[PDB]
Coordinates of all heavy atoms in Angstrom, one line a residue:
Chain A
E4 N 134.0 257.8 98.8 CA 133.0 257.5 99.7 C 132.2 258.7 100.1 O 132.9 259.8 100.3 CB 133.5 256.8 101.0 CG 134.6 255.7 100.8 CD 134.6 254.6 101.8 OE1 134.4 254.9 103.0 OE2 134.9 253.5 101.4
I30 N 123.9 253.1 90.2 CA 122.7 252.2 90.2 C 122.1 252.2 91.5 O 122.7 252.1 92.6 CB 123.3 250.7 89.8 CG1 122.1 249.8 89.5 CG2 124.1 250.2 90.8 CD1 122.2 248.8 88.4
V31 N 120.7 252.3 91.5 CA 120.0 252.3 92.7 C 119.4 251.0 93.0 O 118.7 250.4 92.2 CB 118.8 253.4 92.6 CG1 118.0 253.4 93.9 CG2 119.4 254.8 92.3
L32 N 119.7 250.5 94.2 CA 119.2 249.1 94.7 C 118.6 249.2 96.0 O 118.9 250.1 96.8 CB 120.5 248.2 94.8 CG 121.3 248.1 93.4 CD1 122.6 247.3 93.7 CD2 120.4 247.3 92.3
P33 N 117.7 248.3 96.4 CA 117.1 248.3 97.7 C 118.1 247.9 98.7 O 118.9 246.9 98.6 CB 116.0 247.2 97.6 CG 115.9 246.9 96.2 CD 117.3 247.1 95.5
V34 N 118.1 248.6 99.9 CA 119.0 248.2 101.0 C 118.5 246.8 101.4 O 117.3 246.5 101.3 CB 119.0 249.2 102.1 CG1 117.7 249.2 102.8 CG2 120.2 249.0 103.1
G35 N 119.4 246.0 101.9 CA 119.0 244.6 102.4 C 118.9 243.6 101.3 O 118.3 242.6 101.5
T36 N 119.5 243.9 100.2 CA 119.6 242.9 99.1 C 121.0 242.4 99.1 O 121.9 242.9 99.7 CB 119.2 243.4 97.7 OG1 120.0 244.6 97.5 CG2 117.8 243.8 97.6
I37 N 121.2 241.2 98.4 CA 122.5 240.7 98.3 C 122.9 241.0 96.8 O 122.1 241.1 95.9 CB 122.4 239.1 98.4 CG1 122.2 238.8 99.9 CG2 123.6 238.4 97.8 CD1 122.0 237.3 100.3
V38 N 124.2 241.3 96.6 CA 124.7 241.8 95.4 C 126.0 241.2 94.9 O 126.7 240.6 95.7 CB 124.9 243.4 95.4 CG1 123.6 244.2 95.7 CG2 126.0 243.8 96.4
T39 N 126.3 241.3 93.6 CA 127.6 240.8 93.1 C 128.7 241.5 93.7 O 128.7 242.7 94.1 CB 127.6 241.0 91.6 OG1 127.5 242.5 91.3 CG2 126.5 240.3 90.8
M40 N 129.8 240.7 93.8 CA 131.0 241.2 94.5 C 132.2 241.5 93.5 O 133.4 241.3 93.9 CB 131.5 240.3 95.7 CG 130.5 240.3 96.8 SD 130.7 241.9 97.7 CE 128.9 242.2 98.0
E41 N 131.9 242.0 92.3 CA 132.9 242.5 91.5 C 133.2 244.0 91.9 O 132.3 244.7 92.5 CB 132.7 242.4 90.0 CG 131.8 243.4 89.3 CD 130.3 243.4 89.6 OE1 129.9 243.2 90.8 OE2 129.5 243.6 88.7
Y42 N 134.4 244.5 91.6 CA 134.8 245.9 91.9 C 134.9 246.7 90.6 O 135.7 246.3 89.7 CB 136.1 245.8 92.7 CG 136.5 247.2 93.2 CD1 135.9 247.7 94.3 CD2 137.5 248.0 92.6 CE1 136.2 249.0 94.9 CE2 137.8 249.3 93.1 CZ 137.2 249.7 94.3 OH 137.5 250.9 94.8
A43 N 134.0 247.6 90.4 CA 134.0 248.4 89.2 C 134.2 249.8 89.6 O 133.3 250.5 90.2 CB 132.6 248.2 88.6
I44 N 135.4 250.4 89.3 CA 135.8 251.7 89.7 C 134.9 252.8 89.3 O 134.8 253.8 89.9 CB 137.3 251.9 89.2 CG1 138.0 253.1 90.0 CG2 137.4 252.0 87.7 CD1 139.5 253.0 89.8
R46 N 131.6 252.6 89.1 CA 130.2 252.4 89.6 C 130.1 253.0 91.0 O 131.0 252.9 91.8 CB 129.9 250.9 89.7 CG 128.5 250.6 90.2 CD 128.1 249.1 90.0 NE 129.1 248.3 90.8 CZ 129.2 246.9 90.7 NH1 128.4 246.3 89.8 NH2 130.1 246.2 91.4
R48 N 127.0 252.3 93.6 CA 125.7 251.8 94.0 C 125.1 252.7 95.1 O 125.8 253.1 96.1 CB 125.8 250.4 94.6 CG 126.1 249.4 93.4 CD 126.4 248.0 94.0 NE 126.3 247.0 93.0 CZ 126.9 245.7 93.1 NH1 127.6 245.5 94.1 NH2 126.7 244.8 92.2
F50 N 122.2 252.4 97.9 CA 121.2 251.5 98.5 C 120.2 252.4 99.3 O 120.6 253.1 100.2 CB 122.0 250.6 99.5 CG 122.8 249.5 98.8 CD1 124.1 249.7 98.6 CD2 122.2 248.4 98.3 CE1 124.9 248.7 97.8 CE2 122.9 247.4 97.6 CZ 124.3 247.6 97.4
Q59 N 122.8 253.4 103.3 CA 124.2 252.8 103.5 C 125.1 253.8 102.9 O 124.8 254.5 101.9 CB 124.2 251.5 102.7 CG 125.4 250.6 102.8 CD 125.1 249.2 102.2 OE1 124.1 248.6 102.5 NE2 126.0 248.8 101.2
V60 N 126.4 253.9 103.4 CA 127.3 254.9 102.9 C 127.6 254.6 101.4 O 128.1 253.4 101.1 CB 128.7 254.8 103.7 CG1 129.7 255.7 103.1 CG2 128.5 255.3 105.1
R62 N 129.7 254.3 98.2 CA 131.2 254.3 97.8 C 131.4 253.8 96.4 O 130.5 253.2 95.8 CB 131.9 253.3 98.8 CG 131.6 251.9 98.6 CD 132.7 250.9 99.2 NE 132.1 249.6 99.2 CZ 132.1 248.7 98.1 NH1 132.7 248.9 96.9 NH2 131.5 247.5 98.3
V63 N 132.5 254.1 95.8 CA 132.8 253.6 94.5 C 133.0 252.0 94.6 O 133.5 251.5 95.6 CB 134.1 254.3 93.9 CG1 134.8 253.5 92.8 CG2 133.7 255.8 93.5
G64 N 132.7 251.3 93.5 CA 133.0 249.9 93.4 C 131.9 249.1 92.9 O 132.1 247.9 92.5
Chain B
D32 N 124.4 232.9 91.3 CA 124.8 234.1 90.7 C 123.7 234.7 89.8 O 122.5 234.4 89.9 CB 126.2 233.9 90.0 CG 127.1 235.1 90.0 OD1 126.7 236.2 89.4 OD2 128.2 235.1 90.6
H64 N 128.1 239.0 85.1 CA 128.9 238.6 86.2 C 128.9 237.1 86.4 O 130.0 236.5 86.6 CB 128.4 239.3 87.5 CG 129.1 239.0 88.8 ND1 128.7 237.9 89.6 CD2 130.1 239.6 89.4 CE1 129.5 237.9 90.7 NE2 130.3 239.0 90.6
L96 N 120.3 236.3 91.1 CA 120.5 237.8 91.0 C 120.0 238.2 89.6 O 120.1 237.4 88.6 CB 122.0 238.1 91.0 CG 122.8 237.6 92.2 CD1 124.3 238.0 92.2 CD2 122.2 238.2 93.5
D99 N 120.4 243.6 87.3 CA 121.0 244.7 88.0 C 122.1 244.3 89.1 O 122.6 245.1 89.8 CB 120.0 245.8 88.7 CG 119.2 245.2 89.8 OD1 119.5 244.1 90.3 OD2 118.2 245.8 90.2
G100 N 122.3 243.0 89.2 CA 123.3 242.5 90.1 C 122.8 242.2 91.5 O 123.6 241.9 92.4
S101 N 121.5 242.3 91.8 CA 121.0 242.2 93.1 C 119.9 241.1 93.2 O 119.3 240.8 92.2 CB 120.4 243.6 93.6 OG 119.1 243.7 93.0
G102 N 119.8 240.6 94.4 CA 118.7 239.6 94.6 C 118.2 239.7 96.1 O 118.9 240.1 97.0
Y104 N 117.1 238.2 99.7 CA 117.6 237.1 100.5 C 116.9 235.8 100.2 O 117.5 234.7 100.1 CB 117.6 237.4 102.0 CG 118.8 238.2 102.5 CD1 119.1 239.4 101.9 CD2 119.6 237.7 103.6 CE1 120.2 240.2 102.4 CE2 120.7 238.5 104.0 CZ 121.0 239.7 103.4 OH 122.1 240.4 103.8
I107 N 118.3 234.0 97.2 CA 119.7 233.3 97.4 C 119.4 232.0 98.2 O 120.0 231.0 97.8 CB 120.6 234.3 98.2 CG1 121.3 235.3 97.3 CG2 121.8 233.5 98.9 CD1 120.4 236.3 96.5
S125 N 129.7 234.4 94.6 CA 130.4 235.6 94.4 C 129.5 236.8 94.7 O 129.2 237.6 93.8 CB 131.0 235.6 93.0 OG 132.1 234.7 93.0
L126 N 129.0 236.9 95.9 CA 127.9 237.8 96.2 C 128.0 238.1 97.7 O 128.6 237.4 98.5 CB 126.6 237.2 95.7 CG 126.2 235.8 96.1 CD1 126.0 235.6 97.6 CD2 124.9 235.4 95.3
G127 N 127.2 239.1 98.1 CA 127.2 239.3 99.6 C 126.4 240.6 100.0 O 125.9 241.3 99.1
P129 N 125.9 243.3 103.7 CA 126.4 243.7 105.1 C 125.7 243.1 106.2 O 126.3 243.1 107.3 CB 126.3 245.2 105.1 CG 125.2 245.5 104.2 CD 125.2 244.5 103.1
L135 N 119.4 232.9 106.2 CA 120.6 232.7 105.4 C 121.6 231.8 106.0 O 122.2 230.9 105.4 CB 121.2 234.1 105.0 CG 122.4 234.0 104.1 CD1 122.1 233.4 102.7 CD2 123.1 235.4 103.9
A152 N 132.7 235.0 98.1 CA 133.6 236.3 98.2 C 133.6 236.9 99.6 O 132.5 237.0 100.2 CB 133.0 237.3 97.1
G154 N 134.0 240.0 100.2 CA 133.4 241.4 100.1 C 134.5 242.4 99.6 O 135.7 242.1 99.7
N155 N 134.1 243.5 99.1 CA 135.0 244.5 98.6 C 134.9 245.8 99.4 O 135.0 246.9 98.8 CB 134.6 244.9 97.1 CG 134.7 243.7 96.2 OD1 135.4 242.7 96.5 ND2 134.0 243.8 95.1
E156 N 134.9 245.7 100.7 CA 134.7 246.9 101.6 C 136.1 247.5 102.1 O 136.1 248.5 102.8 CB 133.9 246.5 102.8 CG 132.5 246.1 102.5 CD 131.7 247.1 101.7 OE1 132.0 248.3 102.0 OE2 130.9 246.8 100.9
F189 N 140.6 247.0 97.7 CA 139.2 246.8 98.0 C 138.9 245.5 98.8 O 137.8 245.4 99.3 CB 138.3 246.8 96.7 CG 138.7 245.7 95.7 CD1 138.4 244.4 96.0 CD2 139.5 246.0 94.6 CE1 138.8 243.3 95.1 CE2 139.9 245.0 93.7 CZ 139.6 243.7 93.9
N218 N 137.6 242.5 88.2 CA 138.2 242.7 89.5 C 137.2 242.4 90.5 O 136.0 242.7 90.4 CB 138.8 244.1 89.6 CG 139.7 244.5 88.5 OD1 140.8 244.1 88.4 ND2 139.1 245.3 87.5
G219 N 137.7 241.9 91.7 CA 136.7 241.7 92.8 C 137.0 240.5 93.6 O 137.7 239.5 93.1
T220 N 136.6 240.5 94.9 CA 136.5 239.2 95.6 C 135.6 238.2 94.9 O 135.7 237.0 95.1 CB 136.2 239.3 97.1 OG1 134.9 240.1 97.2 CG2 137.3 240.1 97.9
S221 N 134.7 238.7 94.0 CA 133.9 237.8 93.2 C 134.8 236.9 92.2 O 134.3 235.8 91.9 CB 133.0 238.6 92.2 OG 131.8 239.0 92.9
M222 N 135.9 237.5 91.8 CA 136.8 236.8 90.9 C 137.7 235.8 91.7 O 138.2 234.8 91.1 CB 137.7 237.8 90.2 CG 136.9 238.5 88.9 SD 135.4 239.5 89.4 CE 134.1 238.4 88.9

Side-chain angles (χ1 to χ4, degrees):
Chain A
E4 314 210 322
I30 189 145
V31 179
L32 301 171
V34 67
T36 51
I37 286 181
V38 298
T39 58
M40 291 286 141
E41 86 286 42
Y42 188 78
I44 194 160
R46 180 169 62 193
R48 288 175 162 156
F50 288 97
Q59 190 170 307
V60 171
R62 67 157 171 85
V63 158
Chain B
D32 212 293
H64 178 268
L96 305 179
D99 67 12
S101 81
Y104 276 55
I107 276 64
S125 284
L126 50 64
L135 180 64
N155 298 337
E156 296 305 325
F189 57 77
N218 304 284
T220 52
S221 281
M222 280 63 254

